[PDB]
Design a protein around this nucleic acid. Structure first.
Lengths: 95, 83, 109, 97, 109, 95, 83, 97
DNA sequence: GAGCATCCGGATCCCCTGGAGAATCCCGGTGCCGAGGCCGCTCAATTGGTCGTAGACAGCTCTAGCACCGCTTAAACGCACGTACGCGCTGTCCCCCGCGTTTTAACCGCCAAGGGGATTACTCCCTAGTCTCCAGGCACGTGTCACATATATACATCCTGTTCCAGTGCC
DNA sequence: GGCACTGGAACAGGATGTATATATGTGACACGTGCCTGGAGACTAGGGAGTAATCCCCTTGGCGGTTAAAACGCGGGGGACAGCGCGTACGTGCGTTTAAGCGGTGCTAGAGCTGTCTACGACCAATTGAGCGGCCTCGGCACCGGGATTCTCCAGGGGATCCGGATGCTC
């Protein structure tokens, strides 16, 4: 008996099968992916936290997250992320 | 209204003064336009951050504190104009 | 008596867990209160990021004729993309190596 | 015959003069014109606090003098005293710019 | 019949405000719980830092025959100690200038 | 009258007045001090939150911020600042 | 129990291999001891941070996630070790 | 007469091999011995998870690789092909150490 | 008496150094505006008490980290010969500093005007929180084929022997 | 002036090292399964936040004057740099020692899970006194001005050196 440990294996696996039905992973590569997603999540969340600090807003919104993405992500990665997140927010709002 | 050429406003004697502050003994003639380009790169890199904070703040005017944030995000923190 | 439970990731049409990332923000001590759409937006951003980097990794592995991705392929993916390298200039990948990169003067003749 | 200093003498006196001093080196109004020119390329009709301009200035001379200190070190590493564009490119690449 | 309102900064025997810093951590969003000794420790360490840097600024001002501190004194104070340089490697001081420093090969024979 | 802008100037006047009763202050230098103390405060508070997360501790205490000072502030100031802080927290322990 | 001189345990051919991965084709013989010193200082910094983290953990055993915390706080972040 | 390559051709060969390769370049057991030896100076009786030692080994290897390619840039900047220690002090001091 | 040696004195050539200008420092002199301190306000720290809960402690367990050990070569090392490179000198050429003269726009400073920060009020949209319920991710088992390893061909490459050719010295 | 001698350039071929094709096992990747706790659903309280109104303040716009900075041109000296020689210092190849590395085993220290509770700390009403806005004065300092000191560059003066003449000695 051990305590359950959180992971992103199944979600990244689904995304990989979505982009590449025929490809596999190594476990070391998955460790890099977990470190990657946790790292980017930490970066964006902390940046949004200080934006919430700076406008004295005690509420964080997707506008703040979008500001952080445009601020941190270089180039068209930012605007692609804004497009995808905007679509997700709209179809979540409709659902 | 619109502006088209102000990179030459950083004059060659001004760049010479900057080099004298940096301890530069001799300055080539090819240095100045490169410093204009590099300075342009840095100022645009920080001012895109600054305008991002200003549009997020729902303000139309650029404030100094946002510029301080924009420099400290790249770890080039400037002291004395906060608050 | 009660409606069927429907996952919020399916509402956003996303693979990344809306509820888990929402909980992580709530216990991540970033704000006292979190808007509903912000974890959805963040999960979409991360899902796009992982999607593109996994596409690059799969293409690199297909170049290497391997069906399973390797940390070497990940290093090749990060450093051969300028924009991700600008995102990740300060990161270190375990067992990744570096790009094949020889300075031109180092070559003979 | 009028007095004329040897090359580098007035340069080193400039070194001491501008390095002991703290007062500004960039003419503030052509700089502010450049700032507004770059700003209007991203969002139109931006208005500037004067202190925002000032900070943008202090930071720029800070970044530049960091580059020329690095440039001087790499140039004396290169057994020269005259700086060349490949040296500034080298300094930016070593900094990861 | 309440006792006289005496202050925690005086209770630690320190000049920096314990209550303001405690409040600033409480709504600075670093934890939901905070101990009482942490703002005391924090006020102490910032007072020590300001004390030593103000010592250096005062000596720099007196060496330049000034009875009022200037940011040039602050720059000369921070840059003349290597350990504060490791504290402040990436920090910009407004109107500070740089240290008087000429490379030895630049000097004439 | 204008709404209050809280700042850290007068405490700097008091501590300097202890260490140097004679000297004067320029105001932009005083702003540089406020930037110093706010910057160091944010660094130490961020490290405190990070360590409270890593030990999964809900409470910010003196002991982990001591750990954070040993991390961020180097060497001689680190050990001396530890000394004054321990003296201060023992004095507050004695009320 | 006590180990005394493992600094030369980082052998010369290992440094040659690292220079090969670094893209160096020709390496002076006067390089290796300063590279040992630079590696030495870097490892001192990271394990000092690591033992500080571990001593906060009240553990006698250093662990990997504490090490990667020490690296990211030093600005040399690692992936692939439970991050 | 036995075969012998001219110098550098071999060197470029293991440059290609090792820059292609992914494995760790330094010996393992002296690296645990060294990290135990130096961690002995800060605190007594330390125990090391092997994963932590491997992570330290990878971090050290990447840091040295980055330092070495920076010294490569410095050396080709000085129109030489052989590195010398002042390249390393230059690269570190430009980097900020 | 004459020839030689040698010492002294002047010619000459190369190397130092004092002198004059000038740029900055330093000492007064003046007038000025930021700093420092006093005063009035206000809001935030403090006091006290309460209730809830987070971590310290104890205890147990199991697991992984260390220690010992025995082969087993891979690798470290070292030496030797060789050839490529750092570097120093030196000539050469041209690029930028010094300096002077002319242009100009930077800056002060002065005045008009309005765009927006920003600040208070209002009313409301959203979200933490609680309770219940349930299903997706984790633990864990299993099996299995992608890849590491091994061996046999195959070609790049890389250096040197072979062959044809141009520039130049002596009869 | 030509033929022989010496240095140049192109070419082929062997040996090696790396790729590459195919056989094989194996263990780490991938999938099936129990579960339970973390996610979802519904309702509530309530509160931060969006928005309307204002105002004033701080930014923007413009206009005269002056000058210091900028800019252009001449000159030259200084510095980059190319090329050649030279001595060296690793590079590479062959042999050797060793010590890392792998497989195996035992002990255990401490990492980590679980139960208790008790210290400790957020929450809230009252209140007040510490801390910040407003103001006002003045003296530390910015600006101006003149003399000293120090730096710098040069034209010249001074020392070093060598050779010729005289003279005394000596044969």
């Amino acid at each position: 008996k051990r305590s359950r440990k959180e992971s992103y294996s199944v979600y990244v696996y689904k995304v990989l099968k979505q982009v590449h039905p025929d490809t596999g992973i190594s476990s070391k590569a998955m460790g890099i992916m977990n470190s990657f997603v946790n790292d980017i999540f930490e970066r964006i969340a902390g940046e949004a936290s200080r934006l919430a600090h700076y406008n004295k807003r005690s509420t964080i919104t997707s506008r703040e997250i979008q500001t952080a993405v445009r601020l941190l992500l270089p180039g068209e990665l930012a605007k692609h992320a804004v497009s995808e997140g905007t679509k997700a927010v709209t179809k979540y709002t409709s659902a | 209204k619109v502006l088209r050429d102000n990179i030459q406003g950083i004059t060659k004697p001004a760049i010479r003064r900057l080099a004298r502050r940096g301890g530069v003994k001799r300055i080539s003639g090819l240095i100045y336009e490169e410093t204009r380009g590099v300075l342009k790169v840095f100022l645009e890199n920080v001012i895109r951050d600054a305008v991002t904070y200003t549009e997020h703040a729902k303000r139309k005017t650029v404030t100094a504190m946002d510029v301080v944030y924009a420099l400290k995000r790249q770890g080039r923190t400037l002291y004395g104009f906060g608050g | 008596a009660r409606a069927k439970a429907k996952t919020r990731s399916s509402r956003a049409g996303l693979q990344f867990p809306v509820g888990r990332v929402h909980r992580l923000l709530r216990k991540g001590n970033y704000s006292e209160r979190v808007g509903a759409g912000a974890p959805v937006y963040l999960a979409a951003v991360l899902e796009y990021l992982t999607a593109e980097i996994l596409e690059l990794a799969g293409n690199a592995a297909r170049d290497n004729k391997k069906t399973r991705i390797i940390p070497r392929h990940l290093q090749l993916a990060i450093r051969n993309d300028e924009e991700l390298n600008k995102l990740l200039g300060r990161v270190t990948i375990a067992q990744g190596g570096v790009l094949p990169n020889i300075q031109a003067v180092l070559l003979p003749k | 015959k009028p007095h004329r200093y040897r090359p580098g003498t007035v340069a080193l006196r400039e070194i001491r003069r501008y390095q002991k001093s703290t007062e500004l080196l960039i003419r503030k109004l052509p700089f502010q014109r450049l700032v507004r020119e770059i700003a209007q390329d991203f969002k139109t009709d931006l208005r500037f606090q004067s202190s925002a301009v000032m900070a943008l200035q202090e930071a720029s001379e800070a970044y530049l003098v960091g580059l020329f200190e690095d440039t001087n070190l790499a140039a004396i590493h290169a057994k020269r005293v005259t700086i060349m564009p490949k040296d500034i490119q080298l300094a930016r690449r070593i900094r990861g710019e």
